[PDB]
Structures are given as structure tokens and as C-alpha cells.
Ligand binder design. Sequence first.
Ligand SMILES: COC(=O)N[C@H](C(=O)N[C@H]1CCCCC/C=C\[C@@H]2C[C@@]2(C(=O)NS(=O)(=O)C2(C)CC2)NC(=O)[C@@H]2C[C@@H](Oc3nc4cc(OC)ccc4nc3C)CN2C1=O)C(C)(C)C
Ligand SMILES: [Zn+2]
Length: 197
Amino acid sequence: MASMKKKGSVVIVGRINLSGDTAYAQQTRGEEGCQETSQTGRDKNQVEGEVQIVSTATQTFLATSINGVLWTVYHGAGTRTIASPKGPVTQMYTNVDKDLVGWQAPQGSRSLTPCTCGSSDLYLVTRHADVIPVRRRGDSRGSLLSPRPISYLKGSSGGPLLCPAGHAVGIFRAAVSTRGVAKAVDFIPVESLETTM
Ligand SMILES: COC(=O)N[C@H](C(=O)N[C@H]1CCCCC/C=C\[C@@H]2C[C@@]2(C(=O)NS(=O)(=O)C2(C)CC2)NC(=O)[C@@H]2C[C@@H](Oc3nc4cc(OC)ccc4nc3C)CN2C1=O)C(C)(C)C
Ligand SMILES: [Zn+2]
């Protein structure tokens, strides 16, 4: 009882910069500072952009702001708080059935707008800032136009699928792999987020 520990917070450690003509990853906090920030829950770093790179003590993945909520996957974040300038912030959405969690979007972030285009030509953004064309194949499935080893997609759960106009269509959840090659992806449709809200 006396020695029971607490899990740390999720910490923003970087972002996928989509502000210009060239997408690229940026690191904003190193591993040591990440560990300290996870324990205190106090992160005074400036946040920018729509897609954050996030970490716990044991995992790293992505998180995406849509309509003022920073969304990610439950299999990355669990029920963890997120670190923020004034201390840890509790999830405002948790849905293990959808593999979805969300926190109020951090000050300085920018939010994507949910797609209403009804378009099936999509783009997946990875933690390495690769922009991967994806053809929508169902409510929660899309095929990669150019399949890639699952190694390429690992660590990108929580990232966005976007339409041609840059609206959010979904949150990347899982890869569909045959013999280690991802030919398709599974995503949380933005309509499920909009409902959750
Ligand atoms: C050939 O068989 C297949 O293809 N079968 C497919 C399949 O299992 N794919 C697996 C392949 C795993 C190989 C690597 C794939 C590369 C990237 C991948 C984007 C990521 C990701 O990057 N993660 S990550 O690295 O950031 C990380 C780890 C730090 C966070 N996502 C996952 O890894 C998810 C997690 C779990 O999926 C769910 N876990 C949960 C857990 C919950 O509570 C704990 C609640 C709901 C939930 N819902 C789930 C749907 C398995 N997974 C898959 O992708 C399907 C989806 C079953 C059809
Ligand atoms: Zn759209």
C-alpha cells in the first residue's frame, strides 16, 4: 500500500510539421526530459500544430487535434493523464471499445476539421512525416496504394487520415498485415469521434 506507484502522464515530445510545403518530424523534448515530465505531469513547452508525437515511459505514438480535442489510441495511452503547463490533465473521453481516448487540446495546438466531403481518396500521416495515399475501402478500412512493411507504420497509431482538402477523416488504429506487409489500415472514423463528443 505504502509503495504503490502511479503511472506517469503521456508527454508531447514532438510534432509532425504540416505547416509548409514539406512535411517533417520535429522533436521538442528528449528522452530524459520526457521521463521527468511524465512523472510530474508538468510540461511547460510550447505546443504547435495538429499532429503531436507523444510518449509514455514504454511507448511512443501520435495524437491528433480535431475540434478542440487531442485524440489518440487507448492501446497507447490507456487511462493516462497528459502533461500540461499546470499539471496532469484527465482524459475527457475514454472508449476502450473503439480504442479511443481524448484530452482537451493543449493551448497552442491547431485543430483539424472533420471531413464532410464524402471522398474516398485519403492520405495517412506517419510519425516519420510520410504522407501515404490510402483508398478508403469501408467505414473503417483503407488500402495502401503502395504497401509497406509494418515496421514503417509502427508508432503511428493516433495519427490522421486526411481527405484531399486536409480535413480529418479518421484516426489510424491498426495495420492489416499479410506476411509482415501492410496492404491496408484500420482507422477510427471521424464520425465516431464526433459522436463521442
Ligand atoms: C494479420 O493480422 C492482422 O493484421 N490483424 C489486425 C491487427 O491485429 N493489427 C495489429 C498489427 C500490429 C503490428 C504493427 C502494426 C503497425 C502499426 C500499427 C498502427 C498501430 C501502432 O503503431 N501502434 S503503436 O506502435 O503506435 C503502439 C503499440 C504504441 C501504441 N496499431 C497497433 O499496433 C494495434 C494495437 C492492437 O490493435 C488493437 N489494440 C487494442 C487495445 C485495447 O486496449 C488495450 C482496446 C482496443 C484495441 N483495438 C485494436 C485494433 C494490435 N494493432 C495492430 O496494428 C487487426 C486490426 C486485428 C485486423
Ligand atoms: Zn474533406
